[PDB]
């Protein structure tokens, strides 16, 4: 709930709450009633859809790729980082740190694959997305080990039914995930630079299950983050220039605004 | 236990049950409202106070 | 059993949901709570703060740092105009990657008055008055001092603080105004005229500067997210 | 009829999930309860045990009862090494098959204090002083005791008591670590140096043996479960 | 889990139905509350409203203003038939496009009493008294004011307050009557007769009118709701 | 809590809870009866009372 | 009846009715927190004090 | 609120709310029971008694 | 009502309510312990008390 203006009117003594050096790295705040009279208004709008939570936690696709059911690449694998959408990564680089959990839900998607094979049919193909935390063993063929989920934690889902959904805490080493972070790993201040050990949940692999069809079939994990019980600490500012890099900040330097014609101009190029 | 509380309305109440034995996996605080702009906007130490000027 | 008919609405996914969900590894205890400074829990906290406006633009004077200074000088017939553009945020090219419009394109609405802080960095001896008046929309901008007085205007008299807060209150016709550009509403345009020329004695620099500020009202809300326009990808960062 | 819309989440099993269940033979009665001695109610009972780290190795020295025993000779110059490994365990490839660092690769992040108790198995006439020093990461390893010094270290003065405790302290910037390696985090350097040589008299076998063990503290606790890396299967066991 | 058996009736979409829902965007702040005159929050407000009659018709006095007036004029004998038209509301060709009719084509159902308010609109000298009558039905309506009599009549003596009501009161052997034509259930007939001949002096026109306007009572209900057949579509609007 | 009221009868309860933050999600209030016709119908300044004629 | 009990909290309330005859087929104990090592540490007949050496 | 009554038993409790505005969705009043042979048998105008003949 | 039993332990609480009109569509009666064998076992007329032979 927002503040409300007052009854003012006239003003002749020395208050001027206009004048005011903002060389002090003061933001002054003045009122419609300081530079006119206005009556007392009374406002009812409301300052929530604007809160720090209800602005992150929105769904919003990281990543997807596609894997065979019949061929060579019949798993993907993903090092979690929300650093691979333009769209997510802008909103979280908003604050220096935030603190989260997640909520992953798999929308997987199939599409049967041209072919010549001879009576293809689907009896129903069930996948399994598995989750393996940093420094946990990695599948190579499909049909290690590995794929035994003796204490990783899957989603075994069958096609055809509500998306499958999991929820993370939150997980980091440090007390808030760094979405900057200035510094090396190595005391020699060489080889990665801001590839810090905070935010880095492991490594989520898919695959299927079944054999699908006697033909091929191409499907294709879909991935969503939706940050629950958001506390956002330390605000900077948005991107401008378009992002190069997955794990850093490279960039091409590009225009300071949009360009239109005099400093008189009323109107948008 | 039932939290009941008022829905967001402009210008009324939902049952509420926490389900699941962590408590990283109940509902977002959609709602949870607070504002306190004497952080960033007027980081100065002494307040300037609006009826003079800043600067002597 | 219990008997339940699954109204529609149900095995679908929203991008915008929210509820209960199953945990991953059960009982996995969080790491405790630090109070860094400087903590956000409302994006008006960072929309009120100032930022310096890229007034000026050319074809390179949006390429350096002369997109932010808006160019002074004493020029001896008075009612020349030192700047203008419109106020509608998050679509005017002056005010699409500041501070506050770029938080403003995050929304579809907006309501709440702005604040235009003009800071005269000139010379220490250099003096000069400016009337800067915001003329709602009724008309097609003034291009006179004479026309732009009818309007809410602020004498600035320099000469210590050097700065002046214009403050454009709210005068619309509706509770809210659209980010994106419409006709149904207008923001008006925001001009500045000498008032009384910029009188510079000798030694000093003829040519001065003056930097526009633009911050949020405490009387400010945005209402519906949608997502920017202002970012774009084609294939995934490698 | 109650009306109710399946939320996304429903329709899968979870490797970790947790709900009531349909029984198979309902009202089966379960057998007693034995009070059976050495009852476990948490993992932190086992890995606060003493376990011999087998600190040797080479290349038959990890394939016998000689990857216990740490080397340990009278030299006439002091300041020569007697073992160095850093601190790393379930990773490092002194402490990947020890009690804690077993227990340690089925979690991911771990923190608290670990004791390395070095047991004298001399003769009982030997005497010696080692200087035991931890050196947190700061720096590449002391190669010299008049560096070894600096950090945290204890000077254990043998006879009697054959056991001398260097409990290594909780020094990180963070409120765990990780069990893999990182090099965000790392756990330093763990050395030992003569402080005073081996003194041995006549009749009295002049190479002697140290034992050490790796302990959990009270002030430990492990978070985050995974799956091990050092079991291994190819097809099902006939 | 809690057992339940998903009754049929589940996974279908009513175009009727109403239940809760997901929200879009959550917590999103409506606008205000502003009391714009006139606020409807029934249909019969709008229903209980006078509205013309176009009784006329031929074929070229349903293309003009000549529709809603009904012509009176002076004719030496009497007992001549002024209008005539059955009381069935929503099919009858005379209130198919009246405001009452129009809202009653929503519903299957109505039942209530209708006021017709007939209004001399002569000249200010011209009399004439006229016996409207209604009579229900149990024959195929008068042909006589002599047969006219015995039904329910209201004979309207004009002069001054140019207007007089016929109330239409409910005679029906049901609680409710359809709009769609049906022969279990009929309306009667609505008629009107000269009593006694328009009486004009000289030097004033001796060719008068009447205005009829349909409403509805305060005794008046509307049930079962259905969709209009008066408007219609091909393809979209483009 | 739950608000019980009477199923709509010619000549009874139901439970029902809002489950939902916003209360723009909540079912329609198809009971919601009330009649007041002195609106459009007689909009005049005096009222006319039916004992006599309206004009003199 | 129901059980409520706080979740597992780092640094609240979830009803949970047991819905089945037999008692094998609850939910886990996951919450079931203690400790003990005064056990497989320390299972000496007499505990060494920590302010002198263990033997003579 | 919720309405407990008996099963049909021959020779126990059972919630029931209803879900729904209207009343014309509940579910069927299986259970009513009355009998009322005063009727169709003995419409007769004064009650003959079984104890002497109907007719004199 | 809701019926609150204590699940078939070896050596808690489940709440169950019937939802059907009928009590012939009630879950069946698992427990139900009782036992006496003083039936097909020692049917006899005079109890034989164990203490002396049954016969004379
Ligand atoms: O999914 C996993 O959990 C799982 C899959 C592969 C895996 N890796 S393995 O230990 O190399 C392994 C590899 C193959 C089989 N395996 C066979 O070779 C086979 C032949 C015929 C019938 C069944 C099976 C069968 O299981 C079992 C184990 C472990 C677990």
């Given at each position: 709930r927002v503040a409300d203006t007052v009854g003012t009117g006239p003003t002749n003594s020395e208050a001027i709450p206009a004048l005011t050096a903002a060389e002090t790295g003061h933001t002054s705040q003045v009122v419609p009633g300081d530079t006119m009279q206005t009556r007392h208004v009374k406002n009812y709008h409301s300052?929530?859809?604007?809160?720090i939570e209800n602005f992150l936690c929105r769904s919003a696709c990281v990543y997807f790729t596609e894997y065979k059911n019949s061929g060579a690449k019949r798993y993907a694998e993903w090092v979690l980082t929300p650093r691979q959408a333009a769209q997510l990564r802008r909103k979280l680089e908003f604050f220096t740190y935030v603190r989260f959990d997640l909520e992953l839900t798999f929308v997987i998607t199939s599409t049967q694959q041209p072919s010549t094979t001879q009576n293809q049919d689907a009896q129903i193909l069930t996948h399994q997305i598995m989750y393996v935390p940093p420094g946990g063993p990695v599948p190579d063929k499909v049909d290690s080990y590995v794929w035994q989920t003796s204490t990783n934690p899957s989603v075994f889902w069958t096609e055809g039914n509500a998306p499958p959904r999991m929820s993370i805490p939150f997980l980091s080493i440090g007390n808030a995930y760094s979405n900057f972070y200035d510094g090396w790993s190595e005391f020699s201040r060489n080889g990665v630079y801001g590839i810090n050990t905070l935010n880095n949940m492991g490594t989520l692999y898919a695959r299927h299950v079944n054999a699908g069809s006697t033909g091929p079939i191409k499907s294709t994990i879909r991935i969503y983050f939706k940050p629950k019980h958001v506390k956002a600490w330390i605000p900077r500012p948005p991107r401008l220039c378009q992002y190069e890099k997955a794990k850093n900040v490279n960039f091409q330097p590009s225009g300071v605004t949009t360009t239109r014609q005099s400093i008189t101009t009323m109107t948008n190029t | 236990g039932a939290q009941v509380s008022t829905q967001k309305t402009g210008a009324i109440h939902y049952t509420n049950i926490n389900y699941y034995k962590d408590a990283a996996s109940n509902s977002a605080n959609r709602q949870d409202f607070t504002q306190d702009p004497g952080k960033f906007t007027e980081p100065v130490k002494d307040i300037m106070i609006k009826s003079l000027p800043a600067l002597n | 059993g219990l008997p339940t008919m699954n109204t529609p609405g149900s095995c679908q996914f929203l991008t915008s949901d929210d509820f209960q969900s199953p945990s991953a590894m059960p009982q996995y205890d969080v790491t405790p709570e630090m109070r860094i400074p400087?903590?956000?829990?409302?994006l008006m906290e960072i929309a009120e703060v100032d930022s310096v406006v890229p007034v000026q633009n050319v074809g390179e004077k949006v390429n350096s740092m002369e997109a932010y200074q808006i160019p002074v000088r004493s020029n001896e017939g008075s009612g020349t105009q030192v700047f203008g553009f419109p106020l509608q945020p998050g679509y005017s090219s002056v005010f699409s990657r500041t501070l506050l419009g770029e938080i403003l394109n995050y929304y579809t609405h907006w309501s709440g008055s702005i604040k235009l802080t003009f800071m005269f960095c000139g010379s220490a001896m250099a003096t000069g008055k400016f009337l800067l008046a915001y003329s709602p929309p009724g008309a097609g901008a003034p291009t006179k001092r004479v026309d732009a007085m009818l309007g809410t205007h602020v004498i600035w008299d320099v000469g210590l603080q050097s700065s002046c807060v214009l403050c454009i209150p709210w005068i619309s016709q509706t509770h809210y105004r659209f980010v994106a550009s419409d006709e149904y509403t207008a923001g008006g345009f925001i001009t500045c005229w000498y008032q009384t020329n910029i009188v510079v004695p000798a030694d000093a620099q003829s040519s001065c500067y003056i930097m526009c500020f633009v911050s949020a009202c405490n009387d400010f809300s945005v209402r519906l997210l949608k997502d920017t326009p202002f970012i774009s990808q084609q294939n995934f960062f490698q």
């Amino acid at each position: 709930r927002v503040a409300d203006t007052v009854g003012t009117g006239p003003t002749n003594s020395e208050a001027i709450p206009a004048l005011t050096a903002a060389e002090t790295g003061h933001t002054s705040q003045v009122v419609p009633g300081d530079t006119m009279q206005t009556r007392h208004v009374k406002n009812y709008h409301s300052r929530s859809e604007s809160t720090i939570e209800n602005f992150l936690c929105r769904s919003a696709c990281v990543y997807f790729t596609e894997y065979k059911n019949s061929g060579a690449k019949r798993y993907a694998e993903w090092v979690l980082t929300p650093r691979q959408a333009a769209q997510l990564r802008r909103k979280l680089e908003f604050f220096t740190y935030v603190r989260f959990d997640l909520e992953l839900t798999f929308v997987i998607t199939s599409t049967q694959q041209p072919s010549t094979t001879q009576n293809q049919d689907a009896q129903i193909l069930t996948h399994q997305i598995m989750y393996v935390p940093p420094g946990g063993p990695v599948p190579d063929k499909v049909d290690s080990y590995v794929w035994q989920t003796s204490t990783n934690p899957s989603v075994f889902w069958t096609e055809g039914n509500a998306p499958p959904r999991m929820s993370i805490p939150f997980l980091s080493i440090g007390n808030a995930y760094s979405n900057f972070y200035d510094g090396w790993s190595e005391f020699s201040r060489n080889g990665v630079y801001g590839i810090n050990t905070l935010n880095n949940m492991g490594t989520l692999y898919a695959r299927h299950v079944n054999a699908g069809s006697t033909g091929p079939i191409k499907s294709t994990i879909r991935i969503y983050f939706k940050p629950k019980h958001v506390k956002a600490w330390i605000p900077r500012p948005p991107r401008l220039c378009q992002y190069e890099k997955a794990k850093n900040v490279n960039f091409q330097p590009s225009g300071v605004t949009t360009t239109r014609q005099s400093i008189t101009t009323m109107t948008n190029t | 236990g039932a939290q009941v509380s008022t829905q967001k309305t402009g210008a009324i109440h939902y049952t509420n049950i926490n389900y699941y034995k962590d408590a990283a996996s109940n509902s977002a605080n959609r709602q949870d409202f607070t504002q306190d702009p004497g952080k960033f906007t007027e980081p100065v130490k002494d307040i300037m106070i609006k009826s003079l000027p800043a600067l002597n | 059993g219990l008997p339940t008919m699954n109204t529609p609405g149900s095995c679908q996914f929203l991008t915008s949901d929210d509820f209960q969900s199953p945990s991953a590894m059960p009982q996995y205890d969080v790491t405790p709570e630090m109070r860094i400074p400087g903590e956000v829990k409302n994006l008006m906290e960072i929309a009120e703060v100032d930022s310096v406006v890229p007034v000026q633009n050319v074809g390179e004077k949006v390429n350096s740092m002369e997109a932010y200074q808006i160019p002074v000088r004493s020029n001896e017939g008075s009612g020349t105009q030192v700047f203008g553009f419109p106020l509608q945020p998050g679509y005017s090219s002056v005010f699409s990657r500041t501070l506050l419009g770029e938080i403003l394109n995050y929304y579809t609405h907006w309501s709440g008055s702005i604040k235009l802080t003009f800071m005269f960095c000139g010379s220490a001896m250099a003096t000069g008055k400016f009337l800067l008046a915001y003329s709602p929309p009724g008309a097609g901008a003034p291009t006179k001092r004479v026309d732009a007085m009818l309007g809410t205007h602020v004498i600035w008299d320099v000469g210590l603080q050097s700065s002046c807060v214009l403050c454009i209150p709210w005068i619309s016709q509706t509770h809210y105004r659209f980010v994106a550009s419409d006709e149904y509403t207008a923001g008006g345009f925001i001009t500045c005229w000498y008032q009384t020329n910029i009188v510079v004695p000798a030694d000093a620099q003829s040519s001065c500067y003056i930097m526009c500020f633009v911050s949020a009202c405490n009387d400010f809300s945005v209402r519906l997210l949608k997502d920017t326009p202002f970012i774009s990808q084609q294939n995934f960062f490698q």
